[PDB]
Amino acid sequence: HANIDESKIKDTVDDLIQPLMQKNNIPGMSVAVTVNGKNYIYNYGLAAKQPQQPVTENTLFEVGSLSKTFAATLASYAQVSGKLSLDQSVSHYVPELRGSSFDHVSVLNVGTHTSGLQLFMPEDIKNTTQLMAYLKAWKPADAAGTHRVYSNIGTGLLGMIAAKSLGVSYEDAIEKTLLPQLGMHHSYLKVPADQMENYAWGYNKKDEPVHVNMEILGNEAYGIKTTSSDLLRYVQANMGQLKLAKMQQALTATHTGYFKSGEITQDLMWEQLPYPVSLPNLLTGNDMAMTKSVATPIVPPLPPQENVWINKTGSTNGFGAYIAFVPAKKMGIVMLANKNYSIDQRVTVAYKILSSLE
Numbered sequence: 451h452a453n454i455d456e457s458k459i460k461d462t463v464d465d466l467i468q469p470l471m472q473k474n475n476i477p478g479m480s481v482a483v484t485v486n487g488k489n490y491i492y493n494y495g496l497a498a499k500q501p502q503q504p505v506t507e508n509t510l511f512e513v514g515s516l517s518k519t520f521a522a523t524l525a526s527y528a529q530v531s532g533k534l535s536l537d538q539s540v541s542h543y544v545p546e547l548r549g550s551s552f553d554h555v556s557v558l559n560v561g562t563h564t565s566g567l568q569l570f571m572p573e574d575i576k577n578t579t580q581l582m583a584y585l586k587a588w589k590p591a592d593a594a595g596t597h598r599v600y601s602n603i604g605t606g607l608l609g610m611i612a613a614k615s616l617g618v619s620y621e622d623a624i625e626k627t628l629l630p631q632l633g634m635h636h637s638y639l640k641v642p643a644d645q646m647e648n649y650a651w652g653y654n655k656k657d658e659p660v661h662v663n664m665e666i667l668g669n670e671a672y673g674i675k676t677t678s679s680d681l682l683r684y685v686q687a688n689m690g691q692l693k694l695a696k697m698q699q700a701l702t703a704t705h706t707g708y709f710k711s712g713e714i715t716q717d718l719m720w721e722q723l724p725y726p727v728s729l730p731n732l733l734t735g736n737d738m739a740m741t742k743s744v745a746t747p748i749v750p751p752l753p754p755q756e757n758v759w760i761n762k763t764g765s766t767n768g769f770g771a772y773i774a775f776v777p778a779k780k781m782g783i784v785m786l787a788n789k790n791y792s793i794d795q796r797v798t799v800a801y802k803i804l805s806s807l808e
């Protein structure tokens with residue numbers, strides 16, 4: 451249709467996503483965009499190959515590390531509720547760890563990847579007893595607060611501590627309190643039986659259909675399954691666009707900037723770059739998950755900003771996801787795929803789509 455921005459947005463998105471899917475052999479994708487208070491959802495391809503099922507409005511994708519932002523939102527909710535202080539030590543809240551290295555690690559450190567805990571949970575830790583034994587024996591290579599090391603283990607502690615401060619399990623905190631209050635009714639840590647037909651298969655590096663295996667503290671770090679529509683609602687909530695007072699305060703406060711590292715500002719799990727955004731710096735800023743970098747505190751912390759590009763990547767064995775939004779422009783994007791394809795491509799496609807939107 452002529453003279454309508456919807457047709458123009460669909461053209462932009464189609465022209466980038468179809469070649470992306472072709473050259474990376476991605477079976478199915480959903481892309482959700484919000485701009486000018488309006489929402490646009492585009493579905494491509496297959497949620498499963500055999501029996502084949504199309505991607506639809508109801509299709510659930512694994513979002514991997516986007517799950518970390520929900521642990522951060524829970525901790526922020528606990529903070530604005532007066533139940534959690536981010537400057538206190540981890541061992542203050544986890545008394546089994548008193549006397550260990552966690553006497554000198556703050557909750558803020560595990561919420562900003564500055565504890566020094568390693569990226570991956572050790573494979574042989576299966577239960578709480580093994581986890582605590584590992585944590586009581588652990589010592590960082592550098593003092594907590596000096597370096598940024600992206601960590602699933604630190605995120606796990608952030609979510610565990612937040613949930614306990616609210617007097618519930620993490621799974622209950624998310625599925626009975628947080629997601630319902632955000633109106634995200636098709637988002638789960640455990641997909642129920644009536645939604646299994648909507649749960650896309652992921653396709654791994656051998657093109658085999660796979661679903662994520664949930665291990666200890668995995669809910670916090672990589673457990674969320676959701677639709678692109680639900681995550682677009684989350685993006686709008688993070689920009690204050692929805693009615694839904696403590697929940698809005700909690701969402702906004704996760705965008706507080708606590709450390710600078712490389713090109714990015716580390717917020718509470720979210721990461722942000724200056725807007726207008728340099729594509730080279732956006733690419734550099736999204737290549738920080740596996741190496742150590744120097745972290746410099748921002749004190750007083752930088753208040754939540756409008757004139758920034760806020761983003762998070764996530765992946766599992768079978769899936770690749772990305773969210774970005776710019777509060778000053780009330781625009782955002784969610785890209786979900788059932789193949790894990792390189793983050794530089796996710797970020798470049800997102801940059802091109804949001805740059806087209808004014």
Ligand SMILES: C=C1CS[C@H]([C@@H](C=O)NC(=O)/C(=N\OC)c2csc(N)n2)N=C1C(=O)O
Pocket residue numbers: 513514515516569602662663672739740763764765766767768790
């Ligand atoms: C570089 C990393 C660090 S781990 C981080 C995390 C967040 O999404 N994902 C995982 O830890 C993970 N599985 O957890 C079940 C993962 C990443 S890549 C892959 N084949 N599995 N993801 C990525 C990525 O490529 O996106």
